[model samples]
Target: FELLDLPEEQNSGELKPQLQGAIRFDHVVLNYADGTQAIKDFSLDIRPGETVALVGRSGAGKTSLVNMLVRFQEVSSGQIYLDDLPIRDIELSSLRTQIAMVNQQVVLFNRTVRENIAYGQLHNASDEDVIAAAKAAYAHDFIMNLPNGYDTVLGAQGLNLSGGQRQRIAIARAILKNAPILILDEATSALDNESEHFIQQAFDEAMQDRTTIVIAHRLSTIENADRIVVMDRGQIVEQGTHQELLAKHGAYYQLHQRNFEDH
Candidate 1:
């Protein structure tokens, strides 16, 4: 496979008002304080209830894109919109409250499984609700096996739990958030094959009737996404469905080929 090139984005970046929870990056450009262009003239519109996956190598600016949506990072130029309202204008707390993200880094404290899953934002989540969310993330069975089930507590570092277990717990927490937008930034990167399968189901259900963005290296995992965007060197290089992109033999195709060769 060669460093094949093609047009960047095909759609007009036009999204309707009824597209609730829709996200738009209108000619967005983000430059780090150190003068590096992290993202440049990025434009894309994500529709309501659609799953969009971002695929790129390290340093391709994948995380920077989603981070801007959550306001973890800001744009140097251009605008981002949530439901057609400029994101910068939206109240920060209000904005974050509506988005749930599971990142590669998992943070846990010394608390019961139920308490950890229900840790943020809301206070009224019932134990049953916490269990349901855990079930959704495939964490219920393991928690059930714990010494005291959902009531089980751990050391301050949560060292008793394995990486996959921790990731599922984080995912369960995100599900409990019940937000309109879900972002998974390498959410399953540390999971084994079986673990990934279980968490993928959780991700699929979480994506329903909302806007979901997954930044991933596991191509098979995101193949089912409504669209797959390929980024390279801080810019979008290709965007299309999995089948469509493979047929083009462009950037995504090359990346896929390289990935396959690795295995």
Candidate 2:
């Protein structure tokens, strides 16, 4: 163990693919070895098939929290649960197989849409399955309009496709994976004005029958969440339905008002 410095995730457990998704964080805290604190006594419980949005300024430790679910980073204190079972008890592969993420930056392959969408589920997904997922992501219509349709190989980093289309195809891959837990990153920073509408519609369809968490980049993005969780200095400071938070004229309300300044 001296030679290996990775977290010990070689645990034993299973996450049935057919199971519904849920997550709970209990007094989760993160303290770097250098005494740098990132997440401070954070805790949240999410039920099966609910969509929760996390909103905050930069450096709020938002990314750190979700990275824990994929076993990307270890929690320094407290426990995270998936369906009432400790996440640390689950095997790394099994835990990830249950979660699918659509991040701000979509990683496209130098392959056909069919190949890209079915990348993770090559053994289980079929051509028909890929197309169905494409349709669900609002990508099939435009993809079919491409030169060779799903067989058309993409250029480097999907340069051949529009930003929105590339992002939608990334979403399509997640749909085909059909994981129980979904994480949507409304990555508005890279995107200009083209893909926002496409993302909103696709995300709505993708959230069905899934426990989804959204790290929202825009105030508008958090409006429809079952709960809009506002974070400041790494702890959840306020949470409620969008209108409830809006009525308080508090953190969430102030954040929403600032959006007008940018416009």
Candidate 3:
């Protein structure tokens, strides 16, 4: 559903031949119309094909930052660049094609399961491609269990699926998109043990050779990210590899401890 509700963005430029997924945030700031400062002078450069995790408590502004990349909401100040081109200049259609995202809230239409997984790339995707992506997302087993298999229609008035099942369907769609940049915002939340393992496998497969920005509550999921950034009150508090941040015994360490206690 996140993909379906993008704001209208029309621009004159298109992406160049080489689509390097490099992203840069140059002292970016975001403020709500009501005067709530969501992000404050935040800056970071992510290399092409690198994976980074954003960590913080509920009000930490992680989601506010990534939303800028897709121009869902314009930055109040400063600029965001993709492959050295300011995102505002890149054509909206092209910009979205290069990025794929999975959010906590999964949206399925009143259509068949095949149509759901192949939503964006429906014209170009073959049946084999859809089935492969579904299997990779660990959704094939469940899809086959449906009364009409992949033909089963889904939506409010149709079959009811659990949170985990819906998330897997979303993941499968993202996988099929195969965009250069991937965002998984709370994508692994609220899952059973078996479902978590399956989703983790799907995530690991999705993150390969792509610029990935992940926001997750489960500490284990982000431990292997190339870099882990800790945020608080709209600022970066600390960042490093898992062991490097743990050694500092600062915000990330404290968060790890809290997450440990929670389990």
TM-score of each: 0.84, 0.86, 0.88
lDDT of 2 by residue, 1-263 (tens): 11212566666665443446878999999877777788989888899988898888667877788888777778889999888888876766777777897885658888887888888645368778888888888889888888888888888543368777788888889888888899888664555465667777777777766788988765555787888888877888899999899899988888788862321
Q: After superposition, how far is residue 204 of candidate 3 from its true place, in Å?
A: 2.1
- Sorted on lDDT, highest at the top, how do the candidates line up? 3, 2, 1
Cα-based lDDT at residue 156, candidate 2: 50
Residue 61 CA displacement from its true place in model 3, Å: 0.9
Better of 2 and 3 by TM-score: 3
Q: Tens-digit lDDT track for model 3 on 142-210?
A: 999987889998874545577788789888888888888998875566677787788877887788878
lDDT, candidate 2, equals 0.78
TM-score, predicted candidate 2 vs. hidden true structure: 0.86
Backbone clashes in model 2, listed as residue pairs: none
lDDT of 3: 0.81
- Give the C-alpha lDDT of model 1: 0.77
User: After TM-score superposition, what is the CA distance of residue 7 in candidate 3 from its true location, in Å?
Assistant: 5.5
TM-score of 1: 0.84
* Candidate 1 lowest-lDDT run of ten: 1-10
Q: How does residue 258 of candidate 3 score in lDDT? A: 80
Compute the lDDT of residue 150 as modeled in candidate 3.
Answer: 91
lDDT (Cα, 0-100) at 122 in candidate 3: 59
